[PDB]
Amino acid sequence: RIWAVPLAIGVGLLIVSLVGWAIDARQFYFSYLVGWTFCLTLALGSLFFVMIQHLTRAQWVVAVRRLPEALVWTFPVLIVLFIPILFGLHDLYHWTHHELYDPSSPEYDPILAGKHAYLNVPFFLVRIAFYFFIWTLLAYKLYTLSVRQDVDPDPSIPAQQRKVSAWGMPLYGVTVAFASYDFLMSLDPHWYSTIFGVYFFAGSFFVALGFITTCYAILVRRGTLQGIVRAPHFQDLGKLMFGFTAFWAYIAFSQYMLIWYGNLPEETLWYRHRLEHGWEVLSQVLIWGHFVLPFLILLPWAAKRTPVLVGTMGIWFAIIHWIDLFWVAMPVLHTEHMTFHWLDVTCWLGLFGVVVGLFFYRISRHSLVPQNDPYLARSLAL
């Protein structure tokens, strides 16, 4: 079926990648992070797409509204996929080792009075298990709603979605910041950067715009529809992919020029990442391939709105987040030897299939385009 092929091939591949958790152990936990958080950024990005669609309300991109909402209930499934981190969590973050604060080791890493309150691995349990009570609660309060305004239309149809956006809104941006400050800030904790809570955010809402976009571009050609969602719908998605590629590269470069300048001890993210060990290769071929080829190819409005291109971009626009995030997650291990392993990729094509398994099975579970909705024909007859 349409729902089980990304799932059976991806979970067929994920169950194969059990070999990673068994063999070449410490490799697979962190190929799992670069994959796991990608699925989370996919959840994180396309959810914020729904939010901003409601705050400054936009009845022009609403045919591309129901489908992000499907993407969100991933994140509850992303809970039970937190497990492989936890067995390797004592092996990853380097503050879980607890032979370093003031035990008999030669190291008294200045973490005792500074960080140990914020980080203590039973606290890390709640610092994320708390987020499951929010980012899922948005699902059970939004996805339960927006799927339900179709069959059981309300007197107050959107303004309940606004209520999520009235108090469930800011907590999101907070928990994204502290999440990034808890997951990906901490691999090389000899580093202090305030922006990086947004590089994870923007680098998510960067991507998931593409996945939502390419899905229709796939589901327009030999899909269940072919002409309902008109071209100038995607014309806005381009205007978003530029307006958020800016909000990425502004951030990925403000992380760079600021730290390229000062040369501080916090720089040691990049004395090990950028220059050395086959990764100046990465950053160059990244940025040429991550900002300028999109910002150049999509630019002119004579093929910017065409479906199959922006669909072709969602591949080059989201497959690349592997290359964006493999510049953050894994290199603290292969700092010695830039030899990216087969296990680095099985979880990329795995979770990017497994998330999409659930994503179609829910679109198999119920409708695709909302059978009734405010301003639908206003966006369809456009």
Binding site: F253, Y256, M257, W260, Y261, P300, W301, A302
Partner: protein, 171 residues
């Protein structure tokens, strides 16, 4: 004979009415109204898009080359300086000039085109002193024809006779 006028108070006619005449008859080089009658160039205005993005081509390149030449000529080769060990016009501190200074010299060319499409500075406008075009913004949403090869003859006045016009000046 420089052209016609059509007092159309309808905001909507200019889509459907004027689309008749670009097909049936002549080209209608010039339609007149303040605001964008929406969905015009869908069929009416004869355009895939603006053309002068291809003329915005030379705006970005020269400015980009300007800054990038303002530093390969400046930071290393002619009067360099060991300011803070900065490696001689390494990209990043050049980005907010190789980006931003491009915007100025590339925008102004983006508007030099705008001031060049049929050469907007032509205050000489032998129709504009028409004694009733002077309520352009409010009265109606007008039409016009230069003396094209299908020359403005009584048939055109007869054509727009049934395209409901408050009046028909003939400059």
């Amino acid at each position: 004979i420089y052209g016609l006028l059509a007092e159309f108070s309808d905001p909507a006619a200019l889509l459907h009415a004027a689309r008749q005449v670009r097909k049936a008859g002549y080209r209608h080089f010039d339609a007149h109204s303040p605001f964008p009658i929406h969905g015009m160039d869908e069929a009416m205005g004869l355009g895939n898009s603006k053309v002068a993005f291809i003329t915005f081509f030379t705006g970005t390149i020269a400015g980009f080359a300007l800054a990038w030449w303002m530093q390969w000529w400046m930071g290393a080769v002619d009067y360099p300086l060991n300011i803070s060990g900065k490696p001689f016009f390494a990209l990043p501190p050049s980005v907010p000039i190789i980006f931003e200074l491009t915007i100025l010299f590339s925008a102004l060319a983006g508007v030099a085109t705008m001031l060049a499409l049929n050469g907007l500075p032509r205050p000489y406008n032998p129709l504009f002193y028409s004694k009733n075009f002077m309520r352009v913004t409010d009265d109606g949403f007008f039409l016009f024809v230069a003396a094209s090869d299908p020359k403005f003859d009584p048939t055109a006045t007869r054509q727009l006779l049934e395209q409901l016009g408050g009046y028909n000046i003939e400059v």
